[PDB]
Ligand binder design. Structure first.
Ligand SMILES: OC[C@H]1CNC[C@@H](O)[C@@H]1O
Length: 483
C-alpha cells in the first residue's frame, strides 16, 4: 500500500476514558459477522442454495452484479481472522451458521463437510481463547423450503427450524455456550415481505408476488414461533447438560419525539411498538403490542394460549442491534386503507430540528450518527421490559466501498463513532442497565446485502482484488482501549 497507509493516527490512543475497568466484571467485547456475508464457498462444500443465492441471480439486484460466492473468503482464511480478533484484544466472536450448509434441502440429509467447517472454526476460536456466540439464522433460508411452501409464510417452517436448531445444539453445544436463534427477525419480515428489498423479495408490487398488508405479519408470527420452538428444544434437552444460554437479536432504532406534544410522544411510542415491541412484547409479556393489535387487527395472526406460554420468557438474554436514531412526528389524520406494515406505523420521520441535523450520516442511506440514541435505547429496554439481561449485539458504521487502502484505514470518523456510542452505553449501564456484552459490526469489510461491496463496515479493510486484510485505525483504537 502507499506510504501514507502507515501514518500513526493519534486518535488511536484517545480512549475517551474507556477501559475494561469502566465496565462490569466479566463484560464481553466482541465483533459480529454472518455466514453469507463473510464465508464464501456459496455454491461449494456441499452447501445448498439459499433464497439470497436465487435473489442475487436476477440482474440489477446487487451493484456491479457482485456476489457473495467468495466475498472475504473466511471459509478458508478463518485462522487469520480469528488471529486478528485475538491480536486486537477481543473476547468473543458472534458468527452465524448457514442452515443450507448444514442441511442443503433444509431438512433430512446432513452435509458433513459443512459440519466439519463449523467444527474447525469453533475449535480454533476456542484454542485461541475467543468465546463463540452462534447465531442460527441470518437471512439465509434454504431455497428448498421457500420452493416447497413459501418458507416463513408457512407454519411448516416452525418444526423445520426447531429440528435444525436441535441438531446444532447437539453437534456444537459442548463448546458453544451462547446461542441466538435469529438476527433481526423484523428485517427478515419487513425487507423480505413488505417492500421486497431483501430475499425472497416479496411485496404488493413485487415481481415475485406477495402482499405487504399481511405477509410481513405472517412471517413475523412464524419467526416468533420458530424461535420459541428452538428454545424449547434447548431448554428441555440440552441446557441443563451443556449449561449455556439462548436468546434472540433484535434491531432497535431509537425513535425520539420531534416535540414534547402528546401526539409526537405517542408517535415515537408507536414506532417503538412496531419496530421492537412486535417481537419483544410476545417474548416478555406473551402478547403483541396494543397499538399493533388495534391498527392491524385481523391482518395479524393470534397466539393460542399454548403458543403464548411457549413464547413468553423464551430468552435468557436479548441482543439489541443498535446503530441510529430518528425524530418522530405525528403524521396527522391516518388513512386506514391497508397499504403496508411500514404504513401501519402511521408516523412521520424527521432528520433535523431547528435547522440542525440529528447527526451526520454514514455511507448507508439509513445510518445517522447519533451516540445519545444508544443510551436512550438501552434505558428504554431496561425500564419497559423488567430490566432484562442484554447484549449490545451490533453497533458500527460504514464508509463507501470506493476508497483505497491508503485512505480506507484512516477511519477516524469510525473511531469517533465507537468512542461516543460506547461512552453513551457506559452511562446506561452505570445507571442500572444489565448489559453483559458489546459487539462491533463488523471485523471485516464484507458483502453488505443490497449494497454489495459499495459499503465498508469493517474495522479491518479488505482489498477485494487480493483479499488481503489491513487493520484500520479503529481496530488499533479497540486494541488500545481493551488492553
Ligand atoms: O447493515 C448493517 C448490518 C445490520 N444488521 C445485520 C447485518 O447483516 C448488516 O450488515
Amino acid at each position: 500500500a502507499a506510504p501514507f497507509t502507515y501514518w500513526l493516527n493519534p486518535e488511536i490512543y484517545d480512549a475517551g476514558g474507556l477501559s475494561r475497568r469502566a465496565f462490569p466484571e466479566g463484560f464481553v467485547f466482541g465483533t459480529a459477522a454472518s455466514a453469507y456475508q463473510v464465508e464464501g464457498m456459496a455454491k461449494q462444500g456441499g452447501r445448498g442454495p439459499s433464497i439470497w443465492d436465487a435473489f442475487i441471480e436476477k440482474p440489477g439486484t446487487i451493484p456491479n452484479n457482485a456476489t457473495a460466492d467468495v466475498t472475504v473468503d473466511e471459509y478458508h482464511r478463518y485462522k487469520e481472522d480469528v488471529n486478528i480478533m485475538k491480536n486486537m484484544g477481543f473476547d468473543a466472536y458472534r458468527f452465524s451458521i448457514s442452515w443450507s450448509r448444514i442441511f442443503p434441502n433444509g431438512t433430512g440429509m446432513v452435509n458433513q463437510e459443512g459440519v466439519d467447517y463449523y467444527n474447525r472454526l469453533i475449535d480454533y476460536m476456542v484454542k485461541k481463547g475467543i468465546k463463540p456466540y452462534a447465531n442460527l439464522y441470518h437471512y439465509d433460508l434454504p431455497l428448498a423450503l421457500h420452493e416447497q411452501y413459501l418458507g416463513w409464510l408457512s407454519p411448516n417452517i416452525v418444526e423445520a427450524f426447531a429440528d435444525y436448531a436441535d441438531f446444532c445444539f447437539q453437534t456444537f453445544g459442548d463448546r458453544v455456550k451462547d446461542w441466538f436463534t435469529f438476527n433481526e427477525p423484523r428485517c427478515v419480515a419487513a425487507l423480505g415481505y413488505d417492500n421486497g428489498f431483501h430475499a425472497p423479495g416479496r411485496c404488493s408490487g413485487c415481481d415475485a408476488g406477495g402482499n405487504s398488508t399481511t405477509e410481513p405479519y405472517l412471517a413475523a408470527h412464524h419467526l416468533i414461533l420458530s424461535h420459541a420452538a428452538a428454545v424449547k428444544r434447548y431448554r428441555e434437552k440440552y441446557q441443563l447438560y451443556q449449561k449455556g444460554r439462548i436468546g434472540i437479536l433484535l434491531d432497535f432504532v431509537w425513535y425520539e419525539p420531534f416535540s414534547d406534544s402528546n401526539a409526537d410522544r405517542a408517535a415515537a411510542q408507536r414506532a417503538r411498538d412496531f419496530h421492537l415491541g412486535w417481537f419483544l412484547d410476545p417474548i416478555i409479556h406473551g402478547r403483541y403490542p396494543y397499538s399493533m393489535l388495534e391498527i392491524v387487527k385481523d391482518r395479524m395472526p393470534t397466539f393460542s394460549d399454548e403458543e403464548s406460554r411457549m413464547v413468553k420468557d423464551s430468552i435468557d438474554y436479548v441482543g439489541i442491534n443498535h446503530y441510529t436514531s430518528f425524530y418522530m412526528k405525528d403524521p396527522g389524520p391516518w388513512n386506514l386503507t391497508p397499504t403496508s406494515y411500514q404504513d401501519d406505523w402511521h408516523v412521520g420521520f424527521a432528520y433535523e430540528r431547528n435547522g440542525v441535523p440529528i447527526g451526520a450520516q454514514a455511507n448507508s442511506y439509513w445510518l445517522y450518527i447519533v451516540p445519545w440514541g444508544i443510551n436512550k435505547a438501552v434505558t428504554y429496554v431496561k425500564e419497559t421490559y423488567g430490566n432484562p439481561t442484554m447484549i449490545l449485539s451490533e453497533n458500527g458504521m460504514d464508509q463507501p466501498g470506493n476508497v483505497s487502502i491508503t485512505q480506507g484505514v484512516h477511519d477516524t470518523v469510525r473511531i469517533r463513532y465507537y468512542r461516543n456510542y460506547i461512552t453513551e452505553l457506559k452511562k446506561a449501564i452505570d445507571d442500572g442497565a444489565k448489559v453483559i456484552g458489546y459487539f462491533a459490526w463488523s471485523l471485516l469489510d464484507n458483502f453488505e446485502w443490497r449494497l454489495g461491496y459499495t459499503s465498508r463496515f469493517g474495522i479491518v479493510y479488505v482489498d477485494y482484488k487480493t483479499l488481503k486484510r489491513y487493520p484500520k485505525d479503529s481496530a488499533f483504537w479497540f486494541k488500545n482501549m481493551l488492553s
